[PDB]
Amino acid sequence: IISTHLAKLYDNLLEQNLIRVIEPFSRVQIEHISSLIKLSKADVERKLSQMIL
Amino acid sequence: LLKLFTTMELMRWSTLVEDYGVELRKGSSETPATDVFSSTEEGEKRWKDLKNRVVEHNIRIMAKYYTRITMKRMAQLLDLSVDESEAFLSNLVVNKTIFAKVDRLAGVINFQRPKDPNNLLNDWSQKLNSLMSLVNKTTHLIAKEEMIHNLQ
């Protein structure tokens, strides 16, 4: 019960935080957004990859 | 101080720091009820905060006039570095006061709505509706105007 709850909390957090960095559109570099968002380089690439689909 | 701030014409940060510094920063006065400008203790921080404000004003004015500006060209204008300008734009765009599209590669800043060929056609349709109203009016002024030859 705890795990499920924590998981739902994780998907929402991830989506909220992204919108702010991305917002100019165009070709923002994965690296500049990464710094602002408060994420690591390896983690951001993977999160974005899931998100396109 | 009033004049630069009031014009939407270009200013440059540096010119302002010296210009204001001589005249305005001093803030001599006799009343104890105000002596605040930059002479006071919070006054120091207020001048620090002014860098941010001036540069932001440059962004607003450029958003309207320009539709597309090169990245290189906008950093000079603002008085910011390449990284700083691209970064400062995203914060503004999310916060919603100007809308730019930032290429973090130093390519281009587009203050436009996202270009469509379709978009441009519509803007002409409105102009056309105005253009006809103007042509009907004008014909009348011609008839009174032709009669006279005593006022030349």
Contacts with A23 from chain B: Cβ below 8 Å: 90, 93-94
Contact A28 B93 (CB under 8 A): no
What CA–CA distance (Å, rounded) separates B67 from B119?
Answer: 14
Question: How far is Cα B126 from Cα B76, in angstroms, rounded to an integer?
Answer: 36
- Interchain CB distance below 8 Å, A24 and B102: yes
Contacts of A26 in chain B (CB under 8 A): 101-103, 110
Identify the DSSP state of B114.
Answer: P
Closest C-alpha among B100, B96, B91, B7 to residue B54: B7
Method: cryo-EM
B102 closest CA partner among B119, B84, B90, B117: B90
Comparing alpha-carbon positions, the chain A residue that sits nearest to B93 is: A24
Contacts of A30 in chain B (CB under 8 A): none
- Could you tell me the two tokens for B112? 């436009």
Q: How far is A4 from chain B (nearest CA, A)?
A: 31
- B115 lies within 8 A of chain A by CB: no
Q: Is B7 left (phi over 0), alpha (psi -120 to 50) or beta?
A: beta
For B54, half-sphere exposure in the C-beta direction (CA atoms, 13 angstrom radius) is 22
Q: What are the distances in angstroms from CA A5 to CA A1, A14, A39? A: 6, 15, 22
